[PDB]
């Protein structure tokens, strides 16, 4: 019991996403000064891939 609550029929969606882009959502700037921090710095990222690789590859050894 209680399954009916909410549970819209028809298609299923809730609200607006924060950003537009499917794969490219951030703030802004491109052309980079290489500084890593200034207003002309593009990445605005850090701690890129500090962790070690964890089985790179598809990993589907045999099949479900």
């Amino acid at each position: 019991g209680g399954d009916g609550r909410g549970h819209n029929t028809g298609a299923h969606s809730t609200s607006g996403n924060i950003n537009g882009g499917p794969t490219g959502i951030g703030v802004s700037g491109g052309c980079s000064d290489g500084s890593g921090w200034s207003s002309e710095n593009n990445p605005w990222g850090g701690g890129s891939g500090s962790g070690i690789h964890w089985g790179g590859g598809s990993g589907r050894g045999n099949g479900g």
Binding site: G56, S58, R60, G61
Partner: peptide
């Protein structure tokens, strides 16, 4: 890992 790039199949030799 080089060969096990297929979408679903692949890496059959690499048994678990």
């Amino acid at each position: 890992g080089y060969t096990d790039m297929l979408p679903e199949f692949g890496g059959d030799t690499a048994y678990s």
